[PDB]
Amino acid sequence: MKEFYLTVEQIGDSIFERYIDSNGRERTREVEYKPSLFAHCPESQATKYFDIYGKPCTRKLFANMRDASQWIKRMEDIGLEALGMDDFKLAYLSDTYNYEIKYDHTKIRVANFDIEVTSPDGFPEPSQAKHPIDAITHYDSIDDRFYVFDLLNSPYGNVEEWSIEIAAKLQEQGGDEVPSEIIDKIIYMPFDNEKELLMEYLNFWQQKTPVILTGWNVESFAIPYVYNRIKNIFGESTAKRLSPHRKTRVKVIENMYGSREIITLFGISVLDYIDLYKKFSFTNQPSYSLDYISEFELNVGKLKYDGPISKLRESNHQRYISYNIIAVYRVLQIDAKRQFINLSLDMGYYAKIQIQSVFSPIKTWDAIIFNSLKEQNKVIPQGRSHPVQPYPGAFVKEPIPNRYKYVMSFDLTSLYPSIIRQVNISPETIAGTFKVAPLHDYINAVAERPSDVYSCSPNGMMYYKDRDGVVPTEITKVFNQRKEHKGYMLAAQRNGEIIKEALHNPNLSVDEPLDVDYRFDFSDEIKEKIKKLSAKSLNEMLFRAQRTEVAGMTAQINRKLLINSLYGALGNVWFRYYDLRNATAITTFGQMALQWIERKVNEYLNEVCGTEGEAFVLYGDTDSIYVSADKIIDKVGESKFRDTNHWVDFLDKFARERMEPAIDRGFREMCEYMNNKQHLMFMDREAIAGPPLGSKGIGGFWTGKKRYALNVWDMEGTRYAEPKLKIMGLETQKSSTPKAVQKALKECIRRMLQEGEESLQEYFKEFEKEFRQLNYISIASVSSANNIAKYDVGGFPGPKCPFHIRGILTYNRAIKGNIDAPQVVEGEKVYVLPLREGNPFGDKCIAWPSGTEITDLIKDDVLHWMDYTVLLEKTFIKPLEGFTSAAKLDYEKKASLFDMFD
Template sequence: MFETQQGYIVSRHSGDENGRLSIHYYVKTDKATVKVTIANPETLFFTNAPVEAIATDVHGVDCEPSQLKTFSHDEVTVVRCQSLLLQQQMVAMVKKLGFTVYEEDVKPEDRYLMERHIRGKVTFIGQPDASGQSFSEARLKVGEYEPAWQVWSLDIETSVTRNELLSIGITSGDRKVVLVVSPEQTDLENVYTFADERKLLMAFIKFVRKHSPDIIIGWNVIGFDLMFLDQRFKTLGIKPALGVQGETWRVREAKESGKVFANIAGRVVLDGITMLKVGGYHFNSYSLNNVSQELLDDSKLLAGGDRWQEIERMHREELANFVAYNLQDCVLVEQIFAKLQLIELQQTRVDLTGIPLSQTGGSVASFENLYLPRLHRKGWVAPAWSDDKFVPSPGGFVMNSVPGLYKNVLVFDFKSLYPSIIRTFYVDPLARVVGQALSQEEGVVPGYRGASFQRQFAILPELVAELAHSREQAKQDGNDILSYAIKIIMNSFYGVLGSSVCRFYHAELASSITMRGHELLGRSKQWMEERGAKVIYGDTDSLFITLSDELSEEQAWEAGKQLCAVVNQCLSEWCGDYADIESHLELEFETLYTRFYMPTIRGQEEGSKKRYAGLSGGELIFKGLEAARSDWTPLAKRFQVELFEHLFFDKDLNHYVSSFVADLLEGRYDSELVYTKQLTRPLSKYTKTQPPHVRAARMIDDQRAQQGLPPEYDRGRKRVQYVYTLSGVSPFLDQQALDSLDYQHYIDKQILPIAEGVFQMLNLEVTDILTPQFNLL
């Protein structure tokens, strides 16, 4: 007897079983997460080969003409196969015959959902087994289910000296559990001790199977925690049966990128660092300690590069403190996810685009999920992968700045510029190939690099319009998560069309977006200057202008609003005259800097780009300057902020700088002299140059080798802390590293570069202030 249920797709899978394709999904329902296997599944691809050229009597393969066409206007045949193996063989045969294949790489489990417009919420009908945990012969359609996720925050502790697992901590709301290797029993609440790793790992498997989390979160949880657990499972010969129905998980590392992936049937693993970046959050350091301090005003119970020694000591001698340390990391991650609504953001991305719940990136997948069904409905198949040479499109508009100190700087931004260009000028893969093929000019909108777009065939403008409308509605409803998720999707379209990893890539597409942006910024600049404004800088979608210094703040705001309205009217009229199109371009005026500093390129008279400081609404704002960068010391950031407070509020700069340097020489800022920089690749890859942070990392690993410890930085992708002492670069491991600091270095490299640009604009000589201090060294 068949049953109908509502649920949410947690994970999706396909593979050949007994010579037949199996497509199955793990779906969270109110009762449990169940396995749903699709009835009569098939996998398919398209080809420009005629049916008679590839006709075969092989059982399980069906070829028939299709109503679809290729971008080359060829008719296509659809080849349906009952197994992945058969599809691989048919694809190879078609290619050998000299024909082209299309969409052969679309996974059958993704195509099944895509063609039915299913994202995450689903209604399924299927035949349950006796346990009610599996459904066969199932069919799926769009549903309305809202899941209540069971989320676990997971963190492990390990022995660096023995490369062994010490404990696994788990928190989920009020539940806090630690499984720990310990020779003794304990009366600590919810702490379970085990004689060795094997027994702990076996208990962990049982615990996961019993309580069945939907989503596991953590900090570098895939790249470290799961990777380490997987290695211990393999070493001890244990099958990691952590899937919903006891399936083995798969944790693998990509050879080229070094990125680690985890696949667990019916469960999803989300990494906190990755989710922060998906959410558009930026931190000087993405360490758990730093992020929790900034977001939660809380921190780990231990921090620093040598904390492993204290962890091992607490494990031996102070089990209660060790457990507290393990659980604190879990709690911090849980609180960060909750505060920033990172799981809600991820689910919203799934609901909008249909990407798998576990896929934190996936701009190309998002685009194809949205575009392919629309393309098929219009009668076309996606283009085949091309070996054509990649031609990068021009970057965003960036004009040379006019350096100086200003009052009343107004900033105008185009709202969602690139999506608006797509919508206004009909930039679209299908519209391009149709416009190229048709000779008539009616309905054609010119692009760049020879492109033209036939507006009646454009898909993307309609898609962008739908998303833009949904975003406005989300804003009205106060749904910030939905609004931001839509923004991410719309802004990704340009990057996808300009990326060689997208099958729809063509140089004319991305160029018709960026070069149109250049034109629009240039025209807007002209219209503003014709009305008395002076444009001092432009960047991608923004223009910075100055009006009279004599205007009050209120007058400047009113002048900015009027100028914005005029330019928007000019844009609308120009679009009509240009190609009889409706403008969806919208210039906004939202920022007024009452004081503003645009620097020169260091050591030159030419104005810099993407670097400035301003005072807006009483708040100091830095862009690209030392105070906004992670590779300068806290000292430099403090100095720059305080320097510009003195500059913008007309305080005595000379006295401030000389006093600051005097305090530096007296050691009052020693704790702020630590550099922190990220290793972008393994240490062994730094062969041509040896930057300071690389030398510091090598020193640390050399010391560890002498102690018989494994290297800490051999894999790279970690931040290194170091200082400059009188003997040169030195790793910052503890306070002893501050005993012989090279103050001259910090004056020359951290203070002088910040001060000299400002003093030069004021016709002052900063070295006159600093020279007496030099003599004290």
């Protein structure tokens, strides 16, 4: 087996590495790594090393990392560049694994854990770990077992042991409904006292020290807690045992509102699933509780237990422990689906970095380029420090608020990475600059052509066309790799077809599968064995095919991720290859591109429609343009179409056959104009929207930049059975909006786009007529309560007190002096309802804990005093008018016309 690393750390002058060896054993070693760095040297001094600028460098080998560091400070002092990889861990890795890392995840220990802490006085702060750890469930990937540690006695109660039998039973039979798939993988361990528990858990941790440490919120609660808990009860000494190198640091991070500390365990890679999810799920969620996310992903969350959590251990210790077991399992299921732990490993080993550095694009790319240049005996630039200066972004067309019956959109392919390749932008391919004309000038092609020797950008930058830069080369390398593994896609999948096709008539014999790699499309030169196959073959020849075929999907998706994160690093001052001029070159060029094609499209459609100066592109944005098909559908007449699907195809054909060509023609012109190194500006029809043929629907509308809704029928070739609404930017998409209301608003938008004015008006009247019968929770708006105290002045609203926070105050006053009432905690979200003047709460509104019913101590009055009128007006009506006004509809009959003036 080819050896691969697990974790690497630098402690002093030595590197500590944990790795899987030739025989698959987990080993660990200390290495007095001797790093090498480079300095510029005179021409005479012949060497094999050169910097990305072609200048000669001499390799300086140091006695130990300390010296290398000190040397860099010195050089820095004097003012001379110190070249080479300053992050020795990365160099050590690159040196020790001078090849393509092939890792066997089966040998990598991935732990998934969660603990429980009974705390009667509020959230158990991890920085203090005041209360005992009541329970711990720790799942190990190597053993595929859940190890449970149950504390049977604590100052908060003495409970009985947990029953695996009771746990497996059904809810109705008084069970916990712990899945049968894990019911056998549970190892229970009850403890008489906490000290015995923590001590045995620490031992357990030494026998099975995690390589990858995950869980949910584990790095901001579980680890810090267990760390400080053991620290206080035994001493920082024994607490350090949590780290395989007994070295730990307390990192303190200051966020949006405050600050929180987290523990760094040298020798372990912490991949908190909440961060994993947040970074790779690519989806904004109203809440990140494991409960919400699990429900969303797995369609099921966590045991609906009764009573508060603080008293759940005492009241029902049975449930309490099972609740902890299933909490761990859930994350494991979510990962079983999303596969983020594996995606991380895959990306880490490809870039040869610490697996946790997956969260940093800067670090990921820095390594990817370092290793690439090192193979060519080139030396990376010294990371320079730059001033965070803002810079020009993308261009967003100000759209004319209105309805748009027919719309067709086109997107540019990976604009930024493409622009970097087309123009050939890189820190070392900068040729020079040139007199810059106003951007509009270049968009209309009236400004003087920049140059005829160098590739240019509308911002004034010129790049060499001869040599390919370091950056564009790496992205292309990645771009290619993508289509390389996606070439292995239909080479193990699409090919796994001669297997399911030959599976209908399996010859009767006892033969084994044709043991040969599938990655490559099988041929009749060896795979000729089609019928000779039996039943245990064909059926086995589509496991491997599909087993690896998917493995490709991991590479393709990961390549997409680096490709999309590259611009990220590039426009970031801490990046080794950042350059304000290049960052601007990229965005400015894009600015031009989108508005250039906008011009071209408008010119084309106007000519082919025989009109003059008609604006066909109604809205542009970064890399998308939306065209109004109205004029096109009219050149035929809606009457000439059989049904809806009829004009959809018409448009699809028109776009592909007439527009696509016009567009590419236009961009080639632009590439020549800027004398770019390569034409890579590609645009594809994306969506086709409009109303059902013969309906009174308006098809779509725009409120303003980034705010629209379209009734789409075909998306990039894929035609939907039922039209899907594409809504970007409106209330219907904000969690702050009451559920029942996002519902109604969605229905409103729908009836507007597909049914028409009269329909909307009908639904409006009905919704408003049954508003008062809706459940008080579904009609309340939700908000995040930050800095509650900030505006608290004796339980009353201070100056400039936000409406929802002022609501919190009225609630605090309403329950002040009754510990049995749910507390509104800082940072958390709260439900908010208005209250009709003269209410016993003394204020205009009242808020309470989100996701929960309001305490019955005030429930009956809040229900009697809530202001339905105001509630409706502010949450429902106001936003609706925002849509209808734009689309020129009325959601109510008899509305004067002179409203839309002044």
